[PDB]
Symmetry: C4
């Protein structure tokens, strides 16, 4: 039975801790992969944490980290949400140095991209077996969400980018059923730049808040119809949520176009709340440290800078990183709307650390109809390690 | 199908060993969490040992134990009853530095409390996903049973405390269905103090024997109706079962009010046997060492000090600690009454030990229609460790 | 659905390797329990290796082995046949320093005996939960098979001994359903001594070949009816199969009475083949080394010393030990008779070894309608270990 | 429900990465078996990697590798495709120093061969239990595919060799149902030599591309009917695919007979594509390094040397080794043809390496209707190890 993810995103006042893996603390003595991008997606029965590994373990010479991001050993695997990415619990998912995964109600579909920059291949997996493929269409590091993809009534949608990391690149929407690609679209966005989309379902369409690594410190937004017709632009709120970025004051709200001089960014997320938006951002405007989440009134649809809520989850004395969106299956939340959730990656080691290695632990938050107090559920690991 | 836990508690003569995890002996070389409160609850299919971890492993720098009880890394996880709390077998349950868990017949519901003392949040999980929330209602370390909660015909009940550890605090009963809070009550108990309740079902109501950390060396008792109306008071028996506590002689039996001067205590349990009670207590009146279990005639309903049975399970040359109650699903025991069971936590390391670290192993006992001989199934670990 | 184990034992010509765990070789670097008695029993779906642990791991101070056989930390756990007894795969079964287990077709029933020598308790588990009990009835180290017990049409039978290890002791047959004891019998056997029975089903009755630790170098045999009426005596074959024991020549075949002067013995097994018997024995008449299996014509029913087959499985340059019987569920073998199988324990370390520790690996053989060549599938471990 | 593997092999243009285990990199700190022959077969629900172990772990004295190939400790076990052969995830399969495995749609059947060279036994397992046997029929290291065997409509077929490794030997086809041998054939092939067959299903028959260790640098091919009547010969393509071997030029294409002087070889594979063939081979003509896969027009049926496609998967600066074939169940690929897949073993340590030990990691590729770019997904391990 397929998942109906046609409902509205629940209107949440605040966010409660879902899980914490303590991966890096644990891996000081145990056998934990050195990972990145601990993103989360849910089947109708359980949620899982997907992650990329370098095939190495914490506290081992192979965590040496001079190793390349897009290496032949990079792989997507997964554990149950909250469990650390240890070797024993781990489920192999795909050969990938960039990935997205989502479950459609029947089986999991994942997408690993691997091979060479000039002609990468992205393998689609369905039920733990390759079913289809996409080749670099522009010859420049083909890549995708690094966050849950989105399944609406049996068909799954995700977004990919093939092109330069700075200047103008190319962007497409893909649509699969049972692991077979059945539709695709080019996304026109001159001046605009899209990467590492954080997507969720809403009112029967797919909404993403992505990353502009070229020109904007506000985040791109697109909204995908099931016919692959789409709207695209920026998150209207007059508050910048990329990293790095400038003061909110020094700031302009653009539904239309990138806003700040800054290049570069980090993966982030945001949830549409009617007209308001829950936006996430690092606390530091310059480094990936601390993590908070602001609610802005009419932020989805206007250049608003009216904060209704500020909720800290990682304090600014602590490292954060990537963040992403995902929804709770109705068939678990019990609710009648789609409970919005998100994960926060917390990175330790290089570059900000004395260590030969770099990994991250995660922490997951969900929905909830109440204000939740500010706290920091930071990583915790005592660096450096035996090495 | 929901669990009918409406039956009577079986009338047991003695207690047989259910399981022993040997966690700490095992963790001298293996990868075992450093835990506390190894409590037990049962689904209609298996029993599990829940525990709080600090995200660290035995024999690792992170077991350093200068780390705080209510840390951001504290989590509830679980294994099958008898298995050690090792990293590989472990199932993530919740972000919690205080917890209760119970299964209702369909799925597990757990409750982790985390965040800051002044405004903690308690997240309710159902089927391994947050479904609801409770915020500190009195701003003073919100907390709960540290032992199995109680599900009667689809609805689960547990008890929480928000307030000072010594003086007067506040106490409430909560009632959930399918992970949704559907009722709550304030518990009036001036002069009285309640913490770490050990609860089981009986005659369709919920009976707990809790901890008074203020004023009494006898244990509070409450009895909850499914309408959240309740009786509350003390365990009548004229024998003290808190720790620390005075001689049984020097002692008075109060159904009504706290009895000894002593402040402080430890989590304990007791089972109503018609009018008699099975009460547990440490052997040492002063330290948490040794563990025995006495049956007192008319102890539930009178200031009785008539011992029918004394049964040792941990000898007084050995460390004990927390203890708690839980019931065996009829759908496993095969019986027509609810077989009473309990766990005994055995603590090693700080403060009574030379070590940088503190954890505990457990041992579980059940029901049974026979006198069982005295023995000690103590922890066993050879301290200190490689460190 | 219960198991019908009413069929005849298949008439097998030879024995094929089923599994080898390599536990001790593996545990030189991995996390393997230090075990004894790796016996095997089968559900209608899989076979498992049960074992007693001391709660310790190989290559760890706790394997120190000055620790007592009947310690408070001794436990029965289990893995899938062929897997090593590692900590991660292990399933907790019971608190036991002596045990038997069998599956009846619906669930597993195990029996762990623990507590003090003068008043041990034997806990019966059904579906992984205690359901019943037996107390020492003679106050002298209550004990049982250390090998698969036997389930015939929903009811399971095993044998226990309470008494001295040398001189005359006491012996009983027990009969359970769904973990509830429903019948028991005293076994009259003056002059005779019974221990560590290896039992299998056959023609609707239960046949065992046990251990005489008092007076006989031939093995006791009993045959249990479902009404707990029984025949008992010795294995007629005119060849001794206990260890230690004398030359086969220097030997007499007694259906009736113990045969050689020797005291002591080891756990062994044998399968009735119409009138013939497959008997197992160590190769060395004096030490537990090497292991072979002889077929003797009319050995079940006569003082025969006619060898039809000799098949070596462990050569006499290698350590062996306990051995035991078990049957393959028809619902797996596919056959119409019960395929006879047996396990051989191979012991390393103390007393015959330089080491602080003692454990064993195993190797399992089955049925088969063909002569299988002689070989040695010995333990393999390179002693001593890092220590 | 049995598997219908009667369909045609899909016509694939190129091959996409399925999985990579990173076993050896991972085993630098974790607990990974030292293995060989990481072959792959699929049930209707999941694919698994089977492997032979020596019972030892990487970075342990027992990996010492002076140990013999056909040792008493050699065993077949298995994990989910992509997972490393670690001790915790591992499923015991059989006592084997040579093996094949295939699933028929209901259960897995495996075949381990063990015992002595002069009279080896091959045990057939069905549903994880021995069901049948084959003894050395020629007294000279009985052996088999080391790759997936083949199940067509409930009946499984594989090929075995009993005889010399060089000169003429003997070859047979076996046919089992539910683990019971129900047919066998001798394969007449004078001048010809067959070993380590890589087989898949196609048009309702079984096609293999095997290894000639005697005389030919082209690969033997046979095609088995369900009646065990067969055709046999060589792969016609005028290009040599054994290792070692000579230039393609210096080369002749023989459908009939072995082609080059060279003795010796390595296990390899090939897929019939109508009349064309996908053939695999090491890049180095002399050593087992690098791995590519060529498509040759009319190569199945003619002495053709027309390359349509060359696709590298391991570059010639890196070690390769054994390779083998397997099919994707329709009941997973979703397609209407059988998607051809293959695994490549990558060997590290002795003989080409400074180390006391030898193991291999693997990498798996599948079907796909597109050209996939050249890359190298080589092993990755940093030799030598702590030792
Ligand atoms: C496919 C791919 O390259 N995607 C990139 C992804 O890998 C990461 C993540 C890094 C993991 C990592 C780990 C250890 C070290 C020492 C260094 C890096 C980042 C990032 O911004 O952090 O950027 C993506 C990217 O380049 C941009 O989007 C611009 O196009
Ligand atoms: C939420 C919370 O704080 N609950 C407390 C709970 O954590 C523990 C257990 C301790 C684990 C631990 C472990 C290592 C070390 C070095 C120190 C402590 C105890 C206890 O009495 O032992 O008391 C609860 C408590 O404070 C009282 O009930 C009074 O209100
Ligand atoms: C309940 C109980 O004591 N059963 C005994 C059982 O434990 C064992 C097995 C020993 C394991 C072990 C391991 C490490 C060391 C250093 C020493 C011993 C043996 C045996 O004959 O080997 O004998 C049973 C027995 O005493 C007799 O049947 C006579 O009555
Ligand atoms: C049953 C059996 O012996 N089959 C052989 C098989 O074992 C292997 C694989 C070796 C594993 C290995 C591992 C570590 C070391 C130090 C040495 C070897 C090879 C091979 O060609 O590589 O050849 C098979 C063979 O002899 C031929 O087909 C000729 O008949």
């Amino acid at each position: 039975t397929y998942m109906n993810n046609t409902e509205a995103i629940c209107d949440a006042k605040g966010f409660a801790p879902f899980s914490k893996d303590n991966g890096i603390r644990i891996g000081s003595r145990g056998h934990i992969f050195v990972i990145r991008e601990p993103f989360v997606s849910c089947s109708p029965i359980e949620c899982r944490t997907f992650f990329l590994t370098q095939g190495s373990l914490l506290n081992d010479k192979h965590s040496n980290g001079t190793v390349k991001d897009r290496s032949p050993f990079r792989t997507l695997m997964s554990v149950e949400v909250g469990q650390s990415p240890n070797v024993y619990q781990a489920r192999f998912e795909a050969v990938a140095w960039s990935a997205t995964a989502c479950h459609d109600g029947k089986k999991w579909m994942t997408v690993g991209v691997t091979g060479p920059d000039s002609k990468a291949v992205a393998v689609i997996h369905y039920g733990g077996v390759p079913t289809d493929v996409v080749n670099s269409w522009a010859g420049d590091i083909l890549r995708t969400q690094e966050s849950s993809c989105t399944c609406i009534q049996g068909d799954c949608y995700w977004v990919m980018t093939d092109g330069p990391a700075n200047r103008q690149a190319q962007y497409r929407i893909y649509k699969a059923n049972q692991g077979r690609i059945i539709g695709q679209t080019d996304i026109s966005f001159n001046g605009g730049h899209i990467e590492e989309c954080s997507c969720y379902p809403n009112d029967g369409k797919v909404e993403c808040v992505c990353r502009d690594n070229w020109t904007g410190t506000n985040r791109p937004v697109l909204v995908i119809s099931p016919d692959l017709s789409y709207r695209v632009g920026y998150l209207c709120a007059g508050i910048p949520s990329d990293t790095p970025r400038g003061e909110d004051t020094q700031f302009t709200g653009s539904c239309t176009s990138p806003m700040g001089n800054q290049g570069y960014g980090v993966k982030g997320f945001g949830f549409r709340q009617g007209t308001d938006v829950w936006m996430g951002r690092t606390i530091s405007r310059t480094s990936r440290s601390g993590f908070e989440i602001l609610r802005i009134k009419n932020g989805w649809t206007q250049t608003s800078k009216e904060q209704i809520r500020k909720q800290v989850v990682v304090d600014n004395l602590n490292w954060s990183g990537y963040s992403g969106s995902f929804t709770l299956p109705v068939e678990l939340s019990g609710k009648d709307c789609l409970v919005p959730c998100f994960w926060v990656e917390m990175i330790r080691g290089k570059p900000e650390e004395k260590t030969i290695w770099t990994s991250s632990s995660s922490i997951v938050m969900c929905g909830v109809d109440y204000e939740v107090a500010d706290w920091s559920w930071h990583d915790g690991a005592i660096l450096p390690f035996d090495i």
